Design a protein around this ligand. Structure first.
Ligand SMILES: *[C@@H]1O[C@H](CO)[C@@H](O)[C@H](O)[C@H]1NC(C)=O
Ligand SMILES: *[C@@H]1O[C@H](CO)[C@@H](O)[C@H](O)[C@H]1NC(C)=O
Lengths: 50, 49, 28
């Protein structure tokens, strides 16, 4: 007999990007001043998601 | 056996072409460069903190 | 034993390098 069967495999997943300042602070300038004390966290997270 | 000399010459020319291709400024080794580049940026970020 | 059963024929004995002279049995 001749049998035809199916294999289903994942190749990729959805890309995504996060704005660090917009998620944490939004439009505030006072929040943006205090976020600078924590260092370069947003550049690392953007680099990893990229 | 009947075409031994042709195969020998093609083998030698292919080895020579690999030799020049590695010489004339290749990025084919770029996969080994990233393993160096990704670690140095990891340690520059630790010192900056 | 070298026989026509387990050998196959191609070309002349000039182009091959290292060829020898030997008898080949024919199973008839
Ligand atoms: C094997 O090599 C030797 C030494 O290089 C040479 O004298 C001889 O003719 C060679 N035999 C064959 C069958 O190539
Ligand atoms: C095989 O036989 C031929 C017949 O003349 C001869 O010319 C040749 O030299 C022989 N080959 C060897 C290796 O003796």
């Amino acid at each position: 007999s001749i049998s035809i069967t199916t294999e289903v495999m994942p190749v990729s997943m959805a890309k995504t990007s996060v704005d660090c300042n917009m998620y944490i602070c939004g439009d505030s300038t006072e929040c943006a001043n205090l976020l600078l004390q924590y260092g370069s966290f947003c550049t690392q997270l953007n680099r990893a998601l990229s | 056996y009947e075409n031994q000399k042709q195969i020998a010459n093609q083998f030698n020319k292919a080895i020579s072409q690999i030799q020049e291709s590695l010489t004339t400024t290749s990025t084919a080794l770029g996969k080994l460069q990233d393993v160096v580049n990704q670690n140095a940026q990891a340690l520059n970020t630790l010192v900056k903190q | 034993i070298i026989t026509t059963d387990n050998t196959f024929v191609s070309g002349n004995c000039d182009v091959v390098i290292g060829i020898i002279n030997n008898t080949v049995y024919d199973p008839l």
